[PDB]
Amino acid sequence: AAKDVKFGNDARVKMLRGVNVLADAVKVTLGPKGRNVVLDKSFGAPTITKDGVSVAREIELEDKFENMGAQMVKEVASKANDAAGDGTTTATVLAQAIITEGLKAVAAGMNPMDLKRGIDKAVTAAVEELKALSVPCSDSKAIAQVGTISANSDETVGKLIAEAMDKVGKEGVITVEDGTGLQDELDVVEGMQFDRGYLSPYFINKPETGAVELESPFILLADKKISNIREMLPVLEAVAKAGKPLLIIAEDVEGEALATLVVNTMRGIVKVA
Amino acid sequence: AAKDVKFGNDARVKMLRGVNVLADAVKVTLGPKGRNVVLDKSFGAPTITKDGVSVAREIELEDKFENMGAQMVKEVASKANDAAGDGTTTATVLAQAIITEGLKAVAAGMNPMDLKRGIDKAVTAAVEELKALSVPCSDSKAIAQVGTISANSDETVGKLIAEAMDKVGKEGVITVEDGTGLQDELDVVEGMQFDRGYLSPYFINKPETGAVELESPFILLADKKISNIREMLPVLEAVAKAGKPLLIIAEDVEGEALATLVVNTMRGIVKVAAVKAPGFGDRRKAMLQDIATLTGGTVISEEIGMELEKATLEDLGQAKRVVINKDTTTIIDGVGEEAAIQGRVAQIRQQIEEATSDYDREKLQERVAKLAGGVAVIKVGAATEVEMKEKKARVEDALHATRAAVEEGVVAGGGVALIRVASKLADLRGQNEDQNVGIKVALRAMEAPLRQIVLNCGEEPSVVANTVKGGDGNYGYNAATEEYGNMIDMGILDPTKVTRSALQYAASVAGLMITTECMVTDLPK
Amino acid sequence: AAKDVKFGNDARVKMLRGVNVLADAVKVTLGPKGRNVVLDKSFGAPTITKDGVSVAREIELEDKFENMGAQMVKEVASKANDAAGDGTTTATVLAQAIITEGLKAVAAGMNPMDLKRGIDKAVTAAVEELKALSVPCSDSKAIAQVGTISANSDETVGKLIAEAMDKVGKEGVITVEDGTGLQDELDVVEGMQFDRGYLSPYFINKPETGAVELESPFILLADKKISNIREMLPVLEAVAKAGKPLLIIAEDVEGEALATLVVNTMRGIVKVAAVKAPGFGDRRKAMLQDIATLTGGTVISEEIGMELEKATLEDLGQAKRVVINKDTTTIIDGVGEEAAIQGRVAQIRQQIEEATSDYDREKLQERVAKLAGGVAVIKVGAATEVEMKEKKARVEDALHATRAAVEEGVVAGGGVALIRVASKLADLRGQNEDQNVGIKVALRAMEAPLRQIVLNCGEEPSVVANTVKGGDGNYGYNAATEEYGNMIDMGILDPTKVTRSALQYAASVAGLMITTECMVTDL
Amino acid sequence: AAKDVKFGNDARVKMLRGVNVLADAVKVTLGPKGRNVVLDKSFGAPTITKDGVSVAREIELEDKFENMGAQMVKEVASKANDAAGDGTTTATVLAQAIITEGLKAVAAGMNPMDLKRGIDKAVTAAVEELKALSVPCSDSKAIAQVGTISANSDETVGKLIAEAMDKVGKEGVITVEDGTGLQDELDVVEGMQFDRGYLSPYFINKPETGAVELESPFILLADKKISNIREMLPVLEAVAKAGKPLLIIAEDVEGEALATLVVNTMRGIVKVAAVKAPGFGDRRKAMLQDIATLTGGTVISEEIGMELEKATLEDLGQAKRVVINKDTTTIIDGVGEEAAIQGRVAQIRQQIEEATSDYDREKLQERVAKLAGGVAVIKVGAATEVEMKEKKARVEDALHATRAAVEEGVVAGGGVALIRVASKLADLRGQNEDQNVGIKVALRAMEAPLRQIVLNCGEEPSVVANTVKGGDGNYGYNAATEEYGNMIDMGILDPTKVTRSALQYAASVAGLMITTECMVTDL
Ligand SMILES: Nc1ncnc2c1ncn2[C@@H]1O[C@H](COP(=O)(O)OP(=O)(O)OP(=O)(O)O)[C@@H](O)[C@H]1O
Ligand SMILES: Nc1ncnc2c1ncn2[C@@H]1O[C@H](COP(=O)(O)OP(=O)(O)OP(=O)(O)O)[C@@H](O)[C@H]1O
Ligand SMILES: Nc1ncnc2c1ncn2[C@@H]1O[C@H](COP(=O)(O)OP(=O)(O)OP(=O)(O)O)[C@@H](O)[C@H]1O
């Protein structure tokens, strides 16, 4: 319906209030001495965590403008997350510092475009200086150390990543699985990796894991577009008679086949990814 | 329900409040130093953009009267967008300036009808002066420059448009596609273009793209009206058995067939897109024969005896790709043999030779032109599918602005075009004091875009505008480097068509809406 | 206290709303078709008055900015009433029109100070054109016409004023008072007049007219200033049981040893007034002797030696009525002795015959003119109280208009003269374009009284104004007969002093009022 | 009382909002295109005034923090009016500009103490540059130009002031008073002036001007201080029925045995004033004798032996008018005897010829200068009351500007001089970077009066300021004709005292106000 327009330093201060709220919530958890943040869950016990990703993802404010400044900072925090894998709290703390001093400077009347030009000039110099300052991590010991630090100071995880990196070399493929035994296990078996995502987000069996894990599935290889699901009807019949998950590799998938597969997955009769 | 009327200067001030809100929101983004505007999205992250189109389309106010003043200015801004391809912010800034000074003058008691007569007199003189001031853009370098400026100062897009412009000549066909590689690609293949829109807006596969893009579709050619869908039932069965998108070209489509096809499209069982048959009579039939030759299809007519029910997969034409724009449909890499296309070209060239009527001869000439020149395809190359879609949109509207510059001309951008037009029209008078005030309103309001650009740069708009007025010719203020100079030397150019259309529609809405007294709307409920 | 501050067009439209309120209340009384306005009063009954200045004075608005606008325009009517006593409604309408057109021109972006200069130049030229266009008033028939037109087309009032000016002369004093029967009466009685005012503003009686009246006053005179209260207390003491209010005429009356304790002594049952004596030295002694002989009293002096303690009730003078005004103090009717009054007049006549100095001759001739003219008293007849006050106000307006006519002259009535002198100024130009716009504002506004008269008639004002502008000379539109004719020949005359003062004051105030950007008031 | 406490930028933005309110109300009156402001009054009609200091004074805001900001800026206009009487609007605009840019620099994180030091250093250097750039005023044509420009481009005012200084000399006393006709009148009458003030603040009359005026006062003089009230009661007693207000000139007047019971005795009908006598001993006796002869009165002394009880009304002096001000008390017109006044002037002249001591010669020459110069009285002609008050205020501003010009000098008008001395100070630097930022704040603020004048014209202030900065010398932008030219040649001149005082006071107050972190007020 009708929509509210707010501009000027009033909009900037509403937005700054929002980003201050979000950055407070997630910057509480920064570092190894990061204080716990409790996300009050709608069901059961409230989840308590020091995960900046988990804390940031849940923040949304009652006022629309504060909410939406928080939304932008959270979105770029998640952009730094999936770009790297860690450092959401670091990204949000840096964002809060830069935005606080920047909007304070803009309220002092300095030109925001020139101010941004100064900011990105300085961060470009910072990026090149950091590249010059960077130390290679080809050795296994620093690999184990960074794997430890990333997993909340767990030496075992960094260790396992170290033997995995030794096993598959510098640019090999490493995949995590669940083991029945209490001890950690490591194996090397010939496999495949190719960079393609799922057609639909509903194909994920575990939304918390974020990946479609299928055990003993039938894999179909196709170089043609699946325009109609009638091509997939005998495949569905065969995989339902056999009774195993189904994986499909095709050139393109049109709206019809994808919608039918989404309906089938909602039905619970086949597992098709 | 019941409805609330407001008239007099009260309605005009509610209207003015609304147009001030909308024009503020969109004029923040004017120029290359346009400040970001954040559109709060109902889901996920908000879209932060400097696109005056996106900001304007988003604005709607809580008060009905302010809302509807904003609706009027937004609608005429979008009208200038579709007419030209760019310059919504320029159109809205001009509209705000003219409307502000005009409503102020009307509150000073001058006759609104005479004031509008002054406004449209001044803008008619401005259009004539801008035509006189326009510089042709037949050269490739200014074409690349305007393609760059249209796509937010991207030299690569202007470069690609330049090579496509060289490929297809002065009036050729250029179409944007997506490429797999990170590098940009350019190809030239024989194709088709005809100016017809989709039957229904739901036929668009991508509402954000706005065009129906079908890859390897079956094309049906018909010269008869599809009154019943029972004629399309065997076609639907065949295209569902084959499993490809379907394109339909027919004379007319009635409510029954269109409704059934729309229902099928919500069903998701078939991809059917229908377009009208362009042209009329014998010219229509001949060009449909040309399209059938291009795609290997067959034209179905009631007068011949051929029926739509007797449809086989061989009879329908086929092509590698088709794209249906708002009112234009193009075909890329048709299946039909190039030798048959050359034979058809020779036949219509002999038709040109035997042509005696000027209209028929020019129709045959444009037919042989579209059959012989072909279509250039620019495949966007980048790393991410996201930036793929933004660069595809940038190439689209940049090439639209580029062809706008090509068809009419180009003038030194940065708003100095209207500045020079205003400086060269200071002596235009009106038949009385009211029309004279209208002239003065329009002349002082043509300086609004340059002032707004400079204001977004943070400088003082008054001194910069006075210095630009003091200079003569193409001398103005480069906002990008924040330095003065000649735009043509430094490649800051705007199509004559976009500035002319923006000014014309801004003056149109301002004159049409200054003379508004009564403002009827529903009660706030 | 906290001050609300408004800027630019906000302040200007609040001002204009207040001005429109006040000037519409005033303007519904303009012309012979003008309608009376009922003014509320708490102490007495409501007053149904057609007097413009009364309505203008009593307009006080709740909205403080509109209140300031109304007060500034009310100053126009007050100053017009001060200078002329008639034409307050014309002055207010002209002020409204100048304000409206000037605010339109300001909204058109024109410079307001230049508009004020243009308005003032146009009005200076228009006053010069009125002086050129003015016709002297004489024959006592033009006087009757002026009186009738000034009194809402009341011919009896015009004839009565004409008879009064025929009796006491064109410069003799005339006093309008409440009547006794239904009919107005003319009494050419013996009295005194002198241009002096009251010393203290606390001498104002219950009426708001500003002139204090005494019922059968007791007259005391002096040329040498007394020293102590105790020398003058016995006189008051005698007056304290005389029965008659006391009026003292002296050189100059203090506040310290008279005013404070004369306020503190009584609560206001019977009032005591003190006034200055005109002239100085021998002349002042001469007028004091003349007034004492007129009232039958005596003058205390150092040379005589007779003292206020020795003065009795019979020694001092007595009058039937005295009305004191700031501009001029007049003793209405003093009994004295008619034979003694005649003897004093004759003695002053041989004083004229003996004297040869120009100053002495002119002052003695003023003395004999004042003594022979006497006082004309007009009894305003009406059936009820509010009708009496309304008719008294109309007769007062007629009197002031006739006096303005004899002082300065007459022109065409019904705003025709302003129309003509505006037409004659169509070529007037200033230093720049904004001043020319102000001149045009003034010229357009000068048409406003005529259009307002025609509006009060109910006819279309624009066609009538265009018709009147079409002709020339004293041709205009008689509102009473709703038809076109010669203004002078049909008897509709306006005092040139009244019209000139109205235009000047409206021009000054409105040209100041259009130039305001800010207004500062309370919350 | 509960005190609201605000800290830092909250207090600073509340202050700035109040400052913007007051300084905008003031700044809409700047320049020849400046517009009047309507001030509400309860006792009288609203005053339409262009006087900047008045608009500054009656700004009082509801928001207590904004009120405090407005009061601190109002101090700028009040001090400018005190020192110079003109340029209050310029002072307020400069104060606003310094406050605005200094608060911007504070929000930029710079040290406010250092900003204040930089501002004060820049303003000291700018005052030196103004002294260097100042041109002496003479020829009586520059005087007319100064008067005209100071009075909103009123050439009649400038010519009248020029004639006044040509009559009574460049150092003679001139008094501006309410006129009687529509035209201003010049009266070179005989009077006295002396630099003394009123003893008690309860002597202030109904006008808020701070100078108490007396209508035909009665003069009493003394050199030896009296002891008891009873010795002086008969004099009052005589005055208590004389008719004229009493002005006493003595060595030093108490509050105990005069002021309390003179307040308690009368309620304020006729006012009594008491003032100090200039000089001491023989000099004080000499000026008392001179004033007594000017007014026709006598001086009581121990050596003479004549006592106040023996003094009568005829023995003491009398004047036509007296206006008493704290800075200088002037007797406007004392009748006395013209032959006696001439004889006293001649006697003082042979006293000059006989005397040879430098102090005696200079004081006797001051005596003859005061006696020969007399008093210039200017009757401010206007049609109505509010026009009279506005024109009187403008003529007062012109008078104060001309006096400042003859005291100190003139510079280019229209803020051009401030522009030039800012350009000459572009190389000025302080002890650190924050002081340099304060200097830049001051220099940018000196451009503000010119840009505000141009804004009141309605032109683009930035291009006009840049054009004026482009030129050199007295080249500026004549706002009246909206054209660029030599400021001296077309006569736009500003008193160097006015400009220097405005800059100094705006600098001091604004440099103090930019440095506030906290504000403590009521709830
Ligand atoms: N470097 C530059 N210096 C000066 N003016 C420039 C420069 N680059 C672009 N402009 C001007 O800025 C305007 C372009 O602004 P912008 O791209 O934000 O919007 P638009 O072209 O008016 O339309 P839309 O917002 O609908 O895309 C044009 O008037 C163009 O001439
Ligand atoms: N019969 C008439 N025809 C035309 N004009 C008339 C007639 N009678 C009076 N007038 C005009 O009307 C005005 C007098 O009306 P009115 O007395 O109500 O107003 P005023 O003189 O402005 O002052 P006030 O209302 O205070 O007495 C004058 O301009 C006079 O010329
Ligand atoms: N015609 C003119 N052109 C340019 N500047 C002018 C002109 N007339 C006056 N000025 C300038 O305007 C100022 C005078 O305006 P104004 O009198 O309103 O303000 P002020 O001197 O600061 O004090 P105040 O408002 O209290 O009288 C001076 O700076 C003077 O030089």
UniProtKB/Swiss-Prot annotation, chain A:
Location of N6-succinyllysine modifications: 33, 50, 116
Binding-site positions, ATP: 29-32, 50, 86-90
Annotated localization:
Cytoplasm
Top-rank taxon, per record: Bacteria
The coiled-coil segments of this chain are: none
Cite the post-translational modification comment.
Answer: Phosphorylated reversibly during heat shock.
Q: Spell out which residues are annotated as carrying N6-acetyllysine.
A: 116
Q: What is known of its domains?
A: Each subunit is composed of an apical domain that binds non-folded proteins and GroES, an intermediate domain and an equatorial domain that binds ATP and is involved in inter-ring interactions. Forms a large central channel that appears to traverse the entire length of the cylinder with no obstruction. The central channel of GroEL functions as two cavities, one in each ring, that are separated from each other by the crystallographically disordered 23-amino-acid C-terminal segments of the seven subunits. The entry and exit of polypeptide seem to be restricted to the apical end of each ring.
Q: What family does this chain come from, according to its entry? A: Belongs to the chaperonin (HSP60) family.
Subunit = Forms a cylinder of 14 subunits composed of two heptameric rings stacked back-to-back. Interacts with the co-chaperonin GroES. Can form asymmetrical complexes, composed of one GroEL and one GroES, and symmetrical complexes, formed between one GroEL and two GroES oligomers. The asymmetrical complex is the functional unit. It was suggested that the symmetric heterooligomer may represent a transient intermediate in the chaperonin protein folding cycle.
Q: Function, please? A: Together with its co-chaperonin GroES, plays an essential role in assisting protein folding. The GroEL-GroES system forms a nano-cage that allows encapsulation of the non-native substrate proteins and provides a physical environment optimized to promote and accelerate protein folding, probably by preventing aggregation and by entropically destabilizing folding intermediates. Also plays a role in coupling between replication of the F plasmid and cell division of the cell.
Name of protein? Chaperonin GroEL
Its source organism is Escherichia coli (strain K12)
